[PDB]
Write a protein that holds these residues in place. Structure first.
Motif, short mmCIF file in Angstrom:
data_model
loop_
_atom_site.label_atom_id
_atom_site.label_comp_id
_atom_site.label_asym_id
_atom_site.label_seq_id
_atom_site.Cartn_x
_atom_site.Cartn_y
_atom_site.Cartn_z
N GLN A 30 0.90 -1.14 0.00
CA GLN A 30 0.00 0.00 0.00
C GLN A 30 0.94 1.20 0.00
O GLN A 30 1.93 1.20 0.74
N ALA A 31 0.73 2.13 -0.92
CA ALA A 31 1.54 3.34 -1.00
C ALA A 31 3.05 3.13 -1.08
O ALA A 31 3.82 4.00 -0.66
N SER A 86 8.54 -0.87 4.39
CA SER A 86 8.64 -1.00 5.84
C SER A 86 7.49 -1.67 6.55
O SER A 86 7.60 -2.01 7.72
N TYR A 100 -5.57 6.94 2.62
CA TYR A 100 -5.85 5.87 1.68
C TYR A 100 -5.23 4.53 2.07
O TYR A 100 -5.35 3.55 1.34
N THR A 101 -4.55 4.50 3.21
CA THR A 101 -3.95 3.25 3.64
C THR A 101 -4.87 2.56 4.64
O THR A 101 -4.62 1.41 5.05
N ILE A 123 10.33 -10.34 3.48
CA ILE A 123 11.61 -9.95 2.90
C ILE A 123 12.71 -10.67 3.66
O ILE A 123 13.71 -11.11 3.08
N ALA A 161 -8.01 0.46 1.40
CA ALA A 161 -6.87 -0.38 1.02
C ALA A 161 -7.45 -1.59 0.32
O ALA A 161 -7.03 -1.89 -0.80
N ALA A 217 12.80 -4.51 11.03
CA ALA A 217 12.75 -3.41 10.09
C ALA A 217 13.33 -2.14 10.68
O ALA A 217 12.60 -1.31 11.21
N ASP A 218 14.65 -2.03 10.63
CA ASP A 218 15.40 -0.86 11.10
C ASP A 218 15.25 -0.38 12.53
O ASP A 218 16.14 0.31 13.03
N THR A 268 8.02 -6.65 5.38
CA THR A 268 9.33 -6.82 6.01
C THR A 268 9.53 -8.28 6.41
O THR A 268 10.65 -8.82 6.31
N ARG A 270 16.61 -19.19 7.72
CA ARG A 270 17.10 -19.65 6.40
C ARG A 270 17.95 -20.91 6.34
O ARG A 270 19.17 -20.84 6.47
#
Lengths: 479, 470, 470
Positions: free
Chosen positions: A302-303, A307, C313-314, A315, C319, B310-311, A312, B191
């Protein structure tokens, strides 16, 4: 343990595709049970005084009181060669209407993934035929390359062309569209037929309309069917048109069972949901007859928010990702590949030397060009030199849908623009030069491409010759 | 007898009811070994770890494998002890699962084998070593700028084409050599593909004869992924405890350890806490981490590979983890591109141990200096690419000069590199390491061409490297 | 008999218990028609849609009207079928509620009338049309830059003084004419005030004879607002199915559809999901959206007006929605101010169908070009208002020139505009549309004054417009 309630239950609650039944004393968790009306259901929760059944189809025909019978089979799916060219729902029931699937063998949906020793490093590539990807984002047989992007970025098409380009190679493609629109599915399966692809492709379908359970299952039924060929010497490619939709279906089914949510309503086992799924895509050891099941997971962003949670997660499982840029698409750049963020890890030991040598510089030529241009409206003279072929590369990477390009003629074109053999011709005629050079080579170079092919290399004879041979055409081209 | 029976099966969670008030304790292993009595059943062989006592002679259990096929009523047996696993020379050069069964193809461990329970209280206060003593790895960057502590916890950051495997491999080697210490590698939910690669990379590097491995990969149910770090910990503990060695414990992606925890917590029916994590997060970490230490006899040092959600480093899981880290090793895909391997960032990699009270003025002074000279050079680059190197404030050029030799002198001949370089490999001791940088800073080698201190060991080798192209 | 009795009343949720094990299926209609037996009661007439089977011969039901006045014990009757509604010529030119009762004043539908159940599975895979074929609306902007697909889902963005009603009205007209297709309008939870306006606007535009309407406005209980889109869908389905027409389905504010869903979910006792939405969001959308398509016979194309939760819009609801949209029509209150009506943004309105594989090079090429020339002009404005138009890089002026004719040529004579303009109205077919812009781009009309291509049809009309003031 034979006839009584031990093998027969009675529905207590039916609703929102879920059901709770009394009885079924001998069901095994994971067992496919069958409702009286003949709809299938899988028993998930074995509670002390009831059984949690997830219904795999229409739940309106079922009422409290309906009988539920044991089948004695852990959730499985028909597997075999008969599936090829057929469009079936996650339960292996054909839906294309070409008659029954005459299968003899069967495989369980949830199965163990190849061990640490059951494997071997990927080396054979997988020719996607999509220029930008084979050179910059190589995929090897037994790899899991996530392709992620926004809706309408051309994710489905890439897997389509990739499947089309599997007529030469020995690949048994499998397309699993989870949560997609039957309409889109129909048109996809129809363009596949056109390109003579259902001769090697099976299509498992779980459309937007079907109950969550089916979407939840679709990826697994897909890998199963594919595991057959893979764990039997054959090579399989599995594309899951949407893991976000599966995740979401899972979330739904979860809360429906009132399993405590975790982050973002997503259950605690949302990651494992996917991980265990993609761990099955492997590259089997020669000791096990090196079969290979490649995996192409789709994740809709979405957009463009990479992140995000689910993106994520998926990934951190796959061996790299292909990034389809949204703006790139609409402005006019098919394939909308966003080189920079895109990455393939096993990428390298996949490419044939032909691609290895030439594709190397391509990253740089594109790299520089990328950093040189938010400053839409001017820059160093050395940079004015870089922008030259850099602008022309972008035109060669751009590819036309449904037109898969074979490697041999592909390594030559990727060659030309990197050896200046194209810099003299403006971007206006780059794509023309391509179509041109291709047919010219197919004729004149029909002895040269074979060298690229058979050897997979382009050393001296090839480098020297091709250098002067590109001239054979450039020095005969129109303006 | 001590025979329970299956009451419920909620995915990986399984409840067992025990008759005759036997009730197995918390953490005890329960085997379910069922043979199908008919064509409508399947053969079951599964171990379950007891999690709680819900009352009415019932224990809620977490299965270590898949629960597919369980039937309410199956009989469960109490092993009497928690998941026990093989320890000793028998585990070296071998790969196993959580249960302690080998998963390589080298045949099976004998029943004579000693097997230790994975669950065990950490060393008593009186039992720990008092002085903080640094562990020497013969690796310059490490030993100078981010000294590892014997028994501490190092966070390994970076792991995509930066040389993460070489560094682990080179570590398993040096300690095994100059310290005579075995290493243990625990792969936690991360993995299989990679687990296979590393195993093989260890065959060729030959370092696998000095390391036992345990894999509880990404396809494992929560229970498996959660406990594998305990298994590999036990196997390693035997050396420190019985054979007084200063051994190593690599855990690849401890985050998956905590993730596996929350994944189970939810299933047990625990009130989710911050970000759906388990209310029990801190405790589960500390119990794993408090065993990794140096007692009067030996020690256990762990290099945990960390991979944040994520970071974000404020996320509960890593937030909790850092509280136990004594040093961080950041591998950067920049020094690597320059060819400076190990790609260990000399300015981000930090240590609780780079303090004169521990390393003394000799080491410390030289260290903060190498970190400072690199500061100038790092900030100047922008000025460089604009005004050039021409007349850069005299002293500043002197720094840009000395710096470049410094960052280059930090790379090294890895013994595991010889495989493809030719160069045998080094082992510069902190004493010689400090000296090398000491004199360099004194400008006593400002007349040599950059590549002279490139990929070597002591400062002598730089001089030998001198008598080549100049 | 098949008579249940009221057990509970939790606002719009009502539970009914059925004797003699009759149990009505899920989605079945239940009428409660009670006459007050005394001065302490009220007269009740209410339909309830069965939602679940809670056990003990009980069904949890969602009432389609207000539950005020229900008394535990009232008897409930099972109709045997889900909410059924009138379909055919009988529905055209008429307005109804969810139940299918007219709400206009034109008298009531006969009992002879055919009535279809609103709940019904979508077309079978084998039943859908294979080729993606664009639906021509005779509207330039649309047909060139954001081609609508026969059977797809168009998102209509913009709806405050931008001409949203005119566009819908003009659509109901062209299809009804050049395609012979009826349209259906579903108003879902969104201002009665507006519903009234549009109805009347349809009387005068005369397009109401070619359209059946259904209003489940903003004052309706969750159940009403949730199901109205199904009612209006059914009424429309009858034409595609029985009379093989390529009809239309307008849904004004589908968001309120999903909002109405969550509003009920909570009441049924469902575990809230992301942002308190229903765990069932995706499924409810797909079941509504998967019926809107072209089968072997006819087709159903829907133009859904979307109104997101405060700019975002999310948010789950939209969505989810976008996953089914094949094109977006953005009406902008800028082109409108300029007087360029339809205020359809030629650069934001996007289509899954503007691909040469579908429209061919002729259409596609011309399209991406009109989109590109407008790009230059759009970015230059800032340069214009600063350095003026004087000597703007030759070619760039040529673009600012040609562009202005282009964006102006995109406006049109709407048949529904004649009402107040005089001009009759156009219907330029994509073939002539492409040509018009083709030649324009070729500069073959660069000698005409802007207003010449203003508010017309084909490119011929521009020439006729020429012989007026020049």
């Amino acid at each position: 343990s034979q006839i009584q309630v031990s093998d027969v239950g009675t529905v207590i609650q039916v609703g929102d595709g879920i059901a709770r039944a009394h009885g079924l004393d001998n069901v095994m968790s994971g067992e496919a049970v069958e409702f009286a009306n003949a709809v299938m259901g899988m028993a998930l929760n074995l509670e002390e005084n009831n059984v949690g059944i997830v219904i795999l189809g229409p739940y309106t025909g079922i009422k409290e009181g309906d009988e539920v019978r044991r089948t004695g089979r852990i959730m499985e799916v028909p597997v075999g060669e008969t599936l090829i060219g057929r469009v079936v729902n996650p339960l292996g029931q054909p839906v294309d209407g070409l008659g029954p699937v005459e299968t003899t063998e069967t495989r369980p949906i949830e199965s163990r993934a190849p061990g640490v020793m059951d494997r071997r490093s990927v080396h054979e590539p997988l020719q996607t035929g999509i220029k930008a990807i084979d050179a910059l984002v190589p995929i090897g047989r037994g790899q899991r390359e996530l392709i992620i992007g926004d809706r309408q970025t051309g994710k489905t098409s890439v897997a389509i062309d990739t499947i089309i380009n599997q007529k030469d190679q020995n690949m048994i493609c499998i397309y699993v569209a989870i949560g997609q629109k039957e309409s889109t599915v129909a048109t996809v399966v129809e363009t596949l037929a056109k390109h003579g692809a259902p001769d090697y492709t099976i299509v498992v379908t779980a459309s937007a309309s079907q109950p969550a359970p089916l979407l939840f299952l679709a990826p697994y039924a897909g890998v199963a069917m594919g595991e057959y060929f893979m764990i039997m010497g054959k090579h399989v490619l599995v594309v899951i048109d949407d893991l976000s939709k599966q995740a979401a279906a899972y979330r739904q089914l979860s809360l429906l069972l009132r399993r405590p949510p975790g982050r973002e309503a997503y259950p605690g086992d949302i990651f494992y949901l996917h991980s265990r799924l993609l761990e099955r895509a492997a590259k089997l050891s020669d000791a096990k007859g090196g079969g290979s099941l490649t995996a192409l997971p789709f994740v809709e962003t979405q957009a463009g928010d990479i992140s995000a949670y689910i993106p994520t997660n998926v990934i951190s499982i796959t061996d790299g990702q292909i990034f389809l840029q949204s703006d790139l698409f609409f402005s006019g750049v098919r394939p909308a590949i966003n080189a920079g963020l895109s990455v393939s890890r096993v990428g390298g030991a996949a490419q044939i030397k032909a691609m290895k040598k030439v594709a190397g510089t391509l990253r740089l030529d594109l790299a520089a060009y990328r950093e040189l241009e938010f400053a839409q409206f001017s820059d160093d003279k050395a940079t004015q030199a870089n922008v030259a072929r850099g602008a022309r590369t972008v035109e060669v990477l751009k590819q036309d849908l449904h037109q898969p390009i074979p490697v041999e003629k592909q390594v030559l074109i990727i060659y030309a623009l990197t050896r200046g053999f194209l810099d003299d011709i403006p971007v206006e005629d780059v794509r023309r030069f391509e179509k041109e050079f291709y047919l010219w080579l197919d004729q004149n170079g029909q002895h040269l491409l074979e060298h690229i092919r058979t050897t997979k290399d382009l050393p001296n004879e090839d480098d020297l010759n091709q250098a002067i041979e590109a001239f054979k055409k450039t020095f005969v081209v129109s303006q | 007898m001590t025979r329970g029976r299956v009451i419920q099966v909620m995915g990986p969670v399984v409840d067992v009811k025990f008759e005759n008030g036997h009730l197995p304790a918390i953490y005890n292993a329960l085997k379910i070994q069922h043979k199908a009595r008919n064509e409508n059943e399947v053969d079951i062989d599964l171990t379950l770890e007891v999690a709680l006592h819900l009352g009415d002679d019932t224990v809620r259990t977490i299965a270590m494998a898949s629960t597919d096929g369980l039937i309410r009523g199956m009989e469960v047996i109490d092993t009497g002890a928690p998941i026990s696993v093989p320890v000793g020379q028998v585990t070296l050069g071998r790969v196993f699962n959580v249960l302690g069964e080998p998963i390589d193809l080298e045949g099976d461990i004998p029943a004579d084998a000693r097997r230790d329970p994975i669950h065990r209280p950490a060393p008593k206060f009186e039992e720990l070593a008092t002085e903080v003593e640094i562990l020497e790895t013969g690796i310059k960057v490490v030993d100078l700028l981010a000294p590892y502590i014997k028994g501490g916890k190092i966070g390994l950051f970076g792991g995509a084409g930066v040389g993460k495997t070489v560094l682990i491999q080179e570590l398993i080697h040096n300690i095994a050599q100059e310290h005579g210490g075995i290493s243990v590698f625990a792969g936690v939910g991360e993995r299989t593909r990679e687990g296979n690669d590393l195993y093989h990379e260890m065959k060729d590097s030959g370092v696998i004869s000095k390391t036992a491995m345990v894999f509880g990969q990404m396809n494992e149910p929560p229970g498996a992924r959660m406990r594998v770090a305990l298994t590999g910990l036990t196997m390693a503990e035997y050396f420190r405890d019985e054979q007084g060695q200063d051994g190593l414990l690599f855990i690849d992606n401890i985050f998956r350890f905590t993730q596996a925890g929350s994944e189970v917590s939810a299933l047990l029916g625990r009130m989710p806490s911050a970000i759906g994590y388990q209310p029990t997060l801190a405790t589960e970490m500390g119990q794993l981490q408090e065993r990794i230490t140096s007692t009067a006899k030996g020690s256990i040092t762990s290099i945990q590979a960390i991979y944040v959600p994520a970071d974000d480093y404020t996320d509960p899981a890593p937030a909790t983890t850092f509280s136990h880290l004594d040093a961080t090793t950041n591998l950067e895909r920049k020094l690597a591109e320059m060819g400076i391997y190990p790609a260990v960032d000399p300015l981000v990699s930090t240590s609780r141990a780079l303090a004169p009270e521990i390393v003394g003025e000799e080491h410390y002074q030289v260290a903060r200096k190498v970190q400072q000279t690199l500061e100038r050079y790092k900030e100047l680059q922008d000025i460089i690419a604009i005004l050039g190197m021409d007349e850069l404030s005299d002293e500043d050029k002197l720094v840009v000069h000395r710096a470049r030799r410094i960052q280059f002198f930090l790379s090294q001949n890895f013994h595991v590199a010889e495989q493809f370089t030719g160069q045998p490999g080094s082992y510069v001791p902190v004493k010689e390491t400090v000296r090398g940088f000491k004199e360099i800073l004194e400008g006593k080698y400002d007349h040599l061409p950059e590549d002279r201190f490139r990929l070597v060991g002591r400062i002598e080798e730089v001089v030998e490297k001198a008598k080549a192209m100049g």
